[PDB]
Design an enzyme around this catalytic site. Sequence first.
Site: not given
Lengths: 100, 46, 64, 107, 298, 329
Positions: E35-38
């Site tokens: 989600i948050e830059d994964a």
Amino acid sequence: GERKTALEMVQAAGTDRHCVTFVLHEEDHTLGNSLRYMIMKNPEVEFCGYTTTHPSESKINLRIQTRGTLPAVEPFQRGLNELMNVCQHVLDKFEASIKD
Amino acid sequence: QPMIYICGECHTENEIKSRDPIRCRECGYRIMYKKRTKRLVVFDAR
Amino acid sequence: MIIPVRCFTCGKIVGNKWEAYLGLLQAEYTEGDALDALGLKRYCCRRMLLAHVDLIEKLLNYAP
Amino acid sequence: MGTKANLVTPRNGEPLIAAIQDFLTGAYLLTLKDTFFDRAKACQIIASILVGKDEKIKVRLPPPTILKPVTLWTGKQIFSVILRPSDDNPVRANLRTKGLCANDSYV
Amino acid sequence: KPMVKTKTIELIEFEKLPAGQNATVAVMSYSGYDIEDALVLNKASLDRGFGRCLVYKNAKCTLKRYTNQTFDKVMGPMLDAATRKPIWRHEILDADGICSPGEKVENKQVLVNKSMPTVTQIPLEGSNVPQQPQYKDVPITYKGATDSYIEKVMISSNAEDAFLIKMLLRQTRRPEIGDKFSSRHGQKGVCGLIVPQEDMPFCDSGICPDIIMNPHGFPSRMTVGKLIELLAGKAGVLDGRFHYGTAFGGSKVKDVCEDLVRHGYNYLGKDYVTSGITGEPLEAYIYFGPVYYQKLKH
Amino acid sequence: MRSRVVLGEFGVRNVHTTDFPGNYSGYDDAWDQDRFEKNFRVDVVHMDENSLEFDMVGIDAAIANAFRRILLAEVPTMAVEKVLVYNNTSIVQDEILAHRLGLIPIHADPRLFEYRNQGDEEGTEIDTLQFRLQVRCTRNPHAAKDSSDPNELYVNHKVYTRHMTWIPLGNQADLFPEGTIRPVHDDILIAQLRPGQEIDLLMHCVKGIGKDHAKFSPVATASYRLLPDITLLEPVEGEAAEELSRCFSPGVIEVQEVQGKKVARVANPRLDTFSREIFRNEKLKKVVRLARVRDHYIFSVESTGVLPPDVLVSEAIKVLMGKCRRFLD
């Protein structure tokens, strides 16, 4: 021979056989969704329900939930035997086409 | 007694023992690379 | 350093196809057509040859 | 500080726990007036309320919300799905304009 | 090598020595871990070698010398007891206790030891008996919770016999959930999942991603220097070219679009993918094409 | 409608296989053989050495993707799982070479072995096809043409997968090893060698399944198309044929006549890998309609030498039998 695989889970079964979650061990999407397919294809089931709950794909908790009267072993085995018949007839029509 | 002293500048082996600093035969070359050994190391091939 | 034997996202075998381009870059096709006379009809293996750096030669220039 | 610390702060009075990202757009897309589903799409239901530990009651199968030539499940009460410990709620005033203006507000 | 390169990548000469794998890539949201830059990096490409590492490290057994007493002659463990000839103290060294070029020396074994008599003789007229029976041996052992492999052993000795022992303790820590990526666009994701081959989406030809991003790093970072790098990758390989987007020059979107047309794709290079998990087309198309993922330290 | 996928300029509609009894008020097929073994058939396309293609007709998406996923990494084949080490003098080593070899397709049928439980060498009785790799490089001794190519001053300067000599365990010696034991490819660059280096190994060729570590995949092309059925509505007969023969892939649409204007309708609507420019003529897109159909999940499997693709697809369709009736007692 399914002693350590089909851990059914009717505990607070509203209908006698309601929350029938065959926790299919050592399993993936491959059989999972094909079964899910054939099961869902009977006009007495309401969930085919296949959803791998773990991160690791080994335990596909297919939560079949029939229309209340029946058990859920009856569809489960109808679907597995129907997929037997389907895949074997597919092979029969297939390997006899390699002669083309 | 072993000969485990290759020299990346003198491709030859001495193992002159202690109190003889390094010198690769006829030169300084104190850059010994030491030979590998003969144990059957096992690798997971993954 | 050496040629990936498999196209990381395809499956196709590759390492068999580096001593042909160094013989098909001197028949002097365009790289885009040295990599059509050997089978690579997808993204993947086109990367896995067009993009690779054979440090094998230059490293082995002084290995010992 | 395990169940009351997370969701309610005294410094602001606003929740800290929230759909960080794509849960927002995934759930939005569910809610979009377009998305029409299948009884065969009881699959995605079942990671939620027919699901991992501490949720396996039944689910009441929200009724067949079309009976056309083509029965179909709208995208909303596929979001609004749980069937243990029934409840009640209310809301309003999403991020759009006012007037039935292709409604993305006063949910 | 990079594959959307810049006329200043050549001039450095450091495009003969590229720093990152060149990865097939989708733009796709798998399931709450991205989600948050994964990054849902599939396995069966970590398996086929996408992004190894060869983390070395360095042990320096600075074998001193002393004025009065001597380290000079005193090299060599190998007590050679029964269990591990002798023991996981001195199990894997060698005939001479120094080297081991290739053995998975593990978890606080000995890399090198030395009886360490340094000043056990007092420099003044002190104790007479310490003529090297007074070794408090000082082992050089340490490691982390995985096997290294001693790959080189060095007796590098300057003009003073101050024996070093330089050592190539190589530890091939191939990636895992948590490893660091960059993107060439300050887009530094991490391996959220590691999915297996069969579950990743496949376009129609047969291509399934190595990496996966989700289109949530872009619209609020606005790296539109990445929606284009995936145009001149997939247009430079599908054609054999080797493209340039250079600072204040480059290669525009129109010619690249026409290249994608000539070898059979959109102007926009957006493929038409079906989903592995269930086996039918994704409803909205899926960006693809080569990226150049760097693989950071840390 | 009911198995006609649609390819709007923005997104693909009609994609869930929405025909289950009680999810359509037409009629839905309480599904099996009589309606299904009449509609079913498996055409064949080009059959050849390591690439196979065919067009199953009448499945729905779930069983077809079950095939795909089983062909990739839920079918076992013969490939190395361990590498014993003897004098590995060479350059970069011990985990790439180990895994390089781990990636070389050995060519023994994976239906005359069994899995490997914890045995003597982890086990040495039935499974261990054991391969010996004794490559030595040196100076070609007659090179008066000094300062020449490596191909002329060295000797086996590289390590191809033709030096992988087979070792016999008395088990196998008489059944397989007449010549059907070598790796598929006798040319793979495993590691270059310069004068004074050697390699010597032992290659424990265990069984395995693709889920373990995908170096056990036999297949490369396990991913496919549905089948496009691109329509036309009151066509654009005439010179537009040039457009509706460069928009679609080069063989897809014929261009026949001019007097009988006849923008020549569909010629081969299976050769088109959907470039889809046709929504950007802005005057044609409202004539053509794009439709990949849900019956013919055209397959195209290609192997990696381990087995002929027929053997692989038969093995997959029978491993699905095994899985389905291993939970049916």
